[PDB]
Design a binder for these strands. Structure first.
Lengths: 97, 551, 105, 93, 83, 95, 103, 78, 97
DNA sequence: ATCGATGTATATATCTGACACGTGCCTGGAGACTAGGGAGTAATCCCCTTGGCGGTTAAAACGCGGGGGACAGCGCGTACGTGCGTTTAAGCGGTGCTAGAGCTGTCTACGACCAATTGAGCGGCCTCGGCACCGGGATTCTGAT
DNA sequence: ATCAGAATCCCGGTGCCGAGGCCGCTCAATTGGTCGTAGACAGCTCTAGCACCGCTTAAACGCACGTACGCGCTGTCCCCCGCGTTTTAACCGCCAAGGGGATTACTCCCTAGTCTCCAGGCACGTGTCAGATATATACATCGAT
């Protein structure tokens, strides 16, 4: 048959996803997660759907930035595969925690 | 008695938690001055005033010997405000907010102090009927009229009646003799005192029953300090007498659970707790039509049985399924000969593991069909009727989050059970009543099985009188209601005609408490035995089992 | 003319900007040239962004400016990128970029 | 209830800059929020500065130095030029 | 209804697509857990602020403006939802 | 000669209440002064932005309490709110 | 006065005047300055207590900026509060990364 | 005068930071970075002064230039 | 005798992390500040306290930057901080664009 | 270096609902006038900055020997990518229920304003003891054998 | 391990200048009273959130296989380091000159406030075309031979 060598479908996906702008986290699981986290602070809270959408946008932006900086670290370390310590190192250096 | 500083240190944080609620706290921080606040009738309604300052003071000055006295005052303050102020008012909703903060604060503190819990508990309010109409009912908190705490009337159907005199049954009572009152009464849970440390605990939290442990209550704290354990509870489900039927059913269930091998499965115990002989009498319409001309028996003998399934949950027995059946033997006249009918079944949704619950109910029913088939009963009969709202078939006061199936879901549930029974070659086949009648070439109402409490005896009365002498619309009535009525063939065809006598190897079991559903519902209602939560169901099971063991 | 915006040869409203400068408690008294200056600088910045946004949109062969075009115009211009360094544009997307090392050889 | 906004003004500016281009409602909202953000930044900085100098009035000088502080080099230069040109065209008539 | 274990709703291919947008080429199998943690640590810092605004104005619906303000406070402002 | 103010004597009083043996150097005094000024500025600004968000024109104790719950980390915020409510209650009660 | 009428140590009048003059809002409720002074006083008590502890550990009776820097960086919640502030003559926490230490 | 930041001065600064062994191009890179940071802070301080109609940059101006950039500096009378 | 390379550095660390005195010579830094201010406004006078404040700020910033650089250099399996580390730490912090 | 199989861009037809414009309505902005204080400006004083000269000595600069770490290459093991078949549940479209957001109208308690008043706090003076410093000793690490 | 050999901590004695206490006053906080409105609160409307049910199909999950990459190891080399010696210019002390920061007094003109009038702008409705979507085709390109 025909089988792409490992490492080219990754690049195709990089281009395809950097080209488009749609959301990437599934809407309903993220909504349920947000409600779960909020229920810990004040029981029986109702969420304007626009607010859940804004939360999802902010989380997507934060995670994309974090993965960008993590990939930059992992390239600095003479590697190619981002790893959890990279995420944690990038956030430590950025001044966040 | 705790040292007053011990109490202050422990409880004051819970009081501060209320104080620091702004603005909710403000109306409650000082004693209500009725006149200053522009409210003169306050002391006509509120007879035991209470507020945060008064409570703080009693706490600072060591006026509480034990923490429940603090809790009682807090709740007095709250209920005073819920009493005087309108449900829609400002103070009312503020009060509600404080109480929520309090419930969350108080529970872990009380537990730190060696207590079962810190919650304030009260039983579910009973539903009040109405002597005015058949199934009229009174709603919680809404106003109603009563006489001798026996005859109650909804504010509507009370004023309906022309004039000023009511009639109760055949004697006449002036309306002025009725009490006007709100259905807002809730009975508190009871406490039991540790005989060693003296702490008061919820009787239902600790499951202390005086018959089972007559020496007295000793809390787990006190027991562990001396490395003791409670004496064994001998009033268990397992120790109820075994029967061939109970054994057969429980073996079927436990063999199924063992095959599934799901984590955290428990053993199920099934017991038959009642078996007696009874008769159903043909009602006056049908009796005038067919009995008096000798075309139908005036009554039919059957055996009724009650059975229950139990599981151990958190070390304690839990009754989760109940069922009553009517069995019409081989000596019974046609049309009832060799038939079984399910009078009613009911459940309490605490079975573990959840994802095998329905399967287990089905195994109980399939096993029961298989068992009576073996005895030589040819046919089973099921009326799929969910309980109406606020009625319980067997278990008093279900969990409010246990959903009640509508008729289509309940029908499909019975079909799924029967389909499994067919695939196991227990049930030969089954049909709705209309199709079955068609197949039996039925022509007359006297040919329909006649069961105690069933739909068809009642609708036949109605039909005969509507038609002024009547069978006329029988097929039409069957077609109309057909999805609800199952006829289940256990023994088919020529074999059903030459069977030996039905001989039940199990003995009769006299138990008045379980002769039909009413007695156990009445007991439960009279003794606050609810099945509305895991803890209350565990208590209620424990009390039920004592009653069954002690007779 | 009548409207104070016309006197300055502007397009943004100077009256509304003046009202806002009073209402948010930024100072006891608001001058009379500050609203004009602020409306002018606001208009200039908006024109500056919309220029590049329209250009990037015409690059993608479209007529309507959508959030992606604004994101591109903001993240491509060196200077705007610094003024708007810590703002996430909903539906924006990111700049297409791949590190050199990740590319195949 | 009337809800104030900067829609028509941004639209006029767009028509001046790209006479044959329209702006989607979402981009309209984005610009409507960006103008609010920049105006808030500039006004807050001018307020803090006027408090620093123990002054009780926001005049064009404060707004000018606030623009000098907030925007980077070239944007600051052009914006200051625009501000002075507008205030002169105003005071002239 | 009570809610639990919804954090697994951030599926492995979801984090994969996210990283693929950021410019990553090969993800170590240990990322899919760690990232989830990080995400939680972010949300517990935004909602806890949004709620605090809502609990202030005596409301029970967290409005989009509340989330936008909670974000703007953390130096992570968000254009496109109101202001 | 202008009369400039500060928080020196108050920080001194607090220090004497909390470590009676201990003195404070002049530079540490300036640092504590600037720190108090900065925290007060943050809290006042946050209360102002709250009041504006709710379209209300007064900064009452509620906005201050919410600003404290927003600015400070968990334990410090809880303790500060407790202190605040205690002080307000003792103020309003007595006279 | 009012600082005494609330059991506080910071000045309430001064905080009220500062709330008025600084133009934070059109008006200022009478309850706000008391609460604000109480919060300020508590935070200062915390910082000074930690600094005094650190100084006593250093065999000194007079708190100096180094002790403030130590009492701020050592504690966690305060470090999170005062994240982006630099203290003149403050110094740095003593720490050496593990890899650097000799083998 | 950027050569005024001597090599052993950067060595001491780094030794405080916690490094153990320093390369040879650090010195130049650090000179560049410090020049940039100083340019920014001094530009903001100047702008403040030039507004206040003064010709002497006061410590308050530098403290404000820092507080603006999110680098608040305690100990100079903020 | 001779200290083996790698211990005088550790002793210097232990000594400098304990003290709080300033590490950049006052007069060279003052002349640098004046040179840089020469470009924005001619003939400016600097309050000496302001020069001290500038020096404290620059010291704090450089110390932080070297700390984060050392973190990067240790993460990359090395021990010698290098200009790319400085630049990488600053890029990740988000300080430089 | 070709072949082929796959993905991507391009060219065109169809349909839709989101954007552009036209209209009525109403309230926020504009115009004219006035009273008042905040700010501009002149003058003065004295603090604090700049500039400079001499010495002293700590620190910067430079050269050298070499040990240790950066870096390149290699080989090994496996964790991750890719594709495929199977299974889960998100997405969509309705359908109903209603708590709660939002607006309005009434009323009053709370905060701004102002005059009189006095003590809390700030500026200045003066003392002593907490810490800077120094010399001597005890202890503690580090490196070669 | 065991020695020498520098570094560092401890202890005690001397001194000095910065913090802490005390005194005078003056201006800002306090008290008392009045007046106006911002906000609390009750009541109403009705939208947007929540729940639910069924059907479709994209998307997630599990699994097998292979390979490109992480990583540990080893060798080479050059480059920072520690140290000794020579050079320089920071630092401190002191003095001298003058700019401008700060303060005060005076005057004016810029703005807040008030009223009265009307047009810019928003909600609403309606009409159509830019773009989404589907389909056929030409080209790019990636990998095996």
């Amino acid at each position: 048959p025909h089988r792409y060598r490992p490492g080219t479908v990754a690049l195709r996906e990089i281009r395809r996803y950097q080209k488009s702008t749609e959301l990437l986290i599934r809407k309903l699981p993220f909504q349920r997660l947000v409600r779960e986290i909020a229920q810990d602070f004040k029981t029986d809270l109702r969420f304007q759907s626009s607010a859940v959408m804004a939360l999802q946008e902010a989380c997507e932006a934060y995670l994309v930035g974090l993965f960008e900086d993590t990939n930059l670290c992992a390239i600095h370390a003479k590697r190619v595969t981002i790893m959890p310590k990279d995420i944690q190192l990038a956030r430590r250096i950025r001044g966040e925690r | 008695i705790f040292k007053p500083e011990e109490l202050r240190q422990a409880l004051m944080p819970t009081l501060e938690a209320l104080y620091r609620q702004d603005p909710e706290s403000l109306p409650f921080r000082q004693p209500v001055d009725p006149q200053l606040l522009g409210i003169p009738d306050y002391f006509d309604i509120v007879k035991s005033p209470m507020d945060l300052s008064t409570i703080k003071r009693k706490l600072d000055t060591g006026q509480y010997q034990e923490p429940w006295q603090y809790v009682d005052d807090i709740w007095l303050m709250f209920n005073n405000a819920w009493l005087y102020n309108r449900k829609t008012s400002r103070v009312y909703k503020y009060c509600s907010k404080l109480s929520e903060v309090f419930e969350q604060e108080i529970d872990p503190v009380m537990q730190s102090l060696g207590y079962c819990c810190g919650r304030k508990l009260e039983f579910s309010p009973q539903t009040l009927c109405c002597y005015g109409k058949q199934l009229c009912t009174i709603p919680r908190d809404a106003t109603y009229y009563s006489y001798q705490n026996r005859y109650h009337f909804c504010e509507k159907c009370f004023n309906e009646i022309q004039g000023e005199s009511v009639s109760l049954g055949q004697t006449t009572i002036n309306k002025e003799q009725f009490s006007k009152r709100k259905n807002d009464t809730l009975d508190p849970e009871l406490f039991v005192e540790c005989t060693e440390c003296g702490r008061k605990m919820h009787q239902i939290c600790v499951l202390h029953h005086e018959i089972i442990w007559p020496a007295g209550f000793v809390c787990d704290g006190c027991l562990k300090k001396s490395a003791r354990t409670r004496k064994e509870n001998k009033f268990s489900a397992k120790r109820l007498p075994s029967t061939r039927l109970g054994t057969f059913l429980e073996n079927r269930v436990n063999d199924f659970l063992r095959r599934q091998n799901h984590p955290e499965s428990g053993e199920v115990t099934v017991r038959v707790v009642h078996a007696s002989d009874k008769t159903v009498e043909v009602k006056p319409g049908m009796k005038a039509r067919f009995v008096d001309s000798g075309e139908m028996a005036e009554s039919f003998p059957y055996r009724t049985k009650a059975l229950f399934a139990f599981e151990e949950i958190d070390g304690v027995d839990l009754c989760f399924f109940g069922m009553h059946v009517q069995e019409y033997g081989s000596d019974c006249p046609p049309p009832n000969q060799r038939r079984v009918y399910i009078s009613y079944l009911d459940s309490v949704h605490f079975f573990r593991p959840k994802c095998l619950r329905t399967a287990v109910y089905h195994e109980i029913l399939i096993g029961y069909l298989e068992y009576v088939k073996k005895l030589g009963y040819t046919t089973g009969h099921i009326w799929a009727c969910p309980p109406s709202e606020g009625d319980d078939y067997i278990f008093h006061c279900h969990p409010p989050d246990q959903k009640i199936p509508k008729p289509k879901r309940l029908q499909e549930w019975f079909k799924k059970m029967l389909d499994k029974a067919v695939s196991e070659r227990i049930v030969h086949d089954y049909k709705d009543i209309f199709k079955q009648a068609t197949e039996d070439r039925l022509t007359s109402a006297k040919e329909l099985p006649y069961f105690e409490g069933d739909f068809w005896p009642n609708v036949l009365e109605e039909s005969i009188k509507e038609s002024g002498g009547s069978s006329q619309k029988l097929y039409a009535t069957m077609e109309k209601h057909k999805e609800v009525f199952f006829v289940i063939r256990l023994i088919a065809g020529p074999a059903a005609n030459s069977l030996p006598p039905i001989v039940d190897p199990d003995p009769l079991i006299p138990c008045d408490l379980m002769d039909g559903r009413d007695a156990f519902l009445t007991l439960a209602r009279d003794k606050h035995l609810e099945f509305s939560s895991l803890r209350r169901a565990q208590w209620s099971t424990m009390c039920m089992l004592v009653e069954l063991h002690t007779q | 003319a009548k409207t104070r915006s016309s006197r300055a040869g502007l397009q943004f409203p100077v009256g509304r900007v003046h009202r806002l400068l009073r209402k948010g408690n930024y100072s006891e008294r608001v001058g009379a040239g500050a609203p004009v200056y602020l409306a002018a600088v606001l208009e200039y910045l908006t024109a500056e962004i919309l220029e590049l946004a329209g250009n990037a949109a015409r690059d993608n062969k479209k007529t309507r400016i959508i959030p992606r075009h604004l994101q591109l115009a903001i993240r491509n211009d060196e200077e705007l990128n610094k003024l708007l360094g810590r703002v996430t544009i909903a539906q924006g997307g990111v700049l297409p970029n791949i590190q050199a090392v990740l590319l195949p050889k | 209830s009337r809800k104030e906004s900067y829609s028509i003004y941004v639209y006029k500016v767009l028509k001046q800059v790209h006479p044959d281009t329209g702006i989607s409602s979402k981009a309209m909202g984005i610009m409507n929020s960006f103008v609010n953000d920049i105006f808030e930044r500039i006004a807050g900085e001018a307020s803090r500065l006027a408090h620093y100098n123990k002054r009780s009035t926001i005049t064009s000088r404060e707004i000018q130095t606030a623009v000098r502080l907030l925007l980077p080099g070239e944007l600051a230069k052009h914006a200051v030029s625009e501000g002075t040109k507008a205030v002169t065209k105003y005071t002239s008539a | 209804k009570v809610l639990r274990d919804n954090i697994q709703g951030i599926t492995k291919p979801a984090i994969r697509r996210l990283a693929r947008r950021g410019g990553v080429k090969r993800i170590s199998g240990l990322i899919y857990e760690e990232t989830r943690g990080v995400l939680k640590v972010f949300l517990e810092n935004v909602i806890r602020d949004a709620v605090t605004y809502t609990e202030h104005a005596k409301r029970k619906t967290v409005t989009a403006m509340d989330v936008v303000y909670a974000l703007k406070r953390q130096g992570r402002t968000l254009y496109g939802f109101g202001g």
